[PDB]
């Protein structure tokens, strides 16, 4: 609202909060990002290093869909299925292990970060990591690849 803005409190002060020595002129330093290498060089180098120059290869017809690969972590791994699944597996005595499919829930690669509760799991995914594999093996379980 215009009621609460600084302009209302600024009426009557000739200057309008912009100084008498240096006025409020149009474009004292140039428009936009001008002088990035000449008279704004200090600011550009101090606050945006690496701005100027080229690096890396050019990929012309990039399609993000080819590289689409969402990831999940082992601490979140048990949240894909319902709690009743996990508790039933926990108090089960036959040794049967529930099957968790991350592709069904929309994940492609499993990365092993969190601690895993001690019960067998059949994790089926598209890609695995070495540490996630070893975590699943240590907790007791199976890793299954799907396409």
């Amino acid at each position: 609202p215009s009621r609460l803005r600084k302009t209302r409190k600024l009426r009557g002060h000739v200057s309008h909060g912009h100084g008498r020595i240096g006025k409020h002129r149009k474009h004292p330093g140039g428009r936009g990002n001008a002088g990035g290498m000449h008279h704004h060089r200090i600011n550009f180098d101090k606050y945006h290093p690496g701005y100027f120059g080229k690096v890396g290869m050019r990929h012309y017809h990039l399609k993000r869909n080819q590289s689409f690969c969402p990831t999940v972590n082992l601490d979140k791994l048990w949240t894909l299925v319902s709690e009743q699944t996990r508790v039933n597996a926990a108090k089960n005595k036959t040794g049967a292990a529930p099957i968790i499919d991350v592709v069904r829930s929309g994940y492609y690669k499993v990365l092993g970060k969190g601690k895993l509760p001690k019960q067998p799991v059949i994790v089926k995914a598209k890609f695995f990591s070495r540490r996630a594999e070893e975590k699943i093996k240590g907790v007791g379980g199976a890793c299954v690849l799907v396409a």
């Binding site: 690849l145 799907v146 396409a147």
Partner: protein, 102 residues
Amino acid sequence: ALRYPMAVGLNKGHKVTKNVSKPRHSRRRGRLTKHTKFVRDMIREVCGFAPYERRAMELLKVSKDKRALKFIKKRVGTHIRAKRKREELSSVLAAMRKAAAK
């Protein structure tokens, strides 16, 4: 052992049976028909050959094969078209030589 389908490798991809079917009739275009061959050879017989074609035929007759290929490529365009044209001209020359001998 275990052979799980994978997203990577030589046999990457979800497995599914692939059903055979008759190819679409649109794919048949360009196939040479007997009547069309008859028409084209009649027209060639009445017309003759282009000047560049006969110059290339002279080059092949004197057996400068690389020169003929380079000249045809320059005169016509792509290397594939040049190779096809050179093959057809050599076939024409062979047919003419056989007819002259017999």
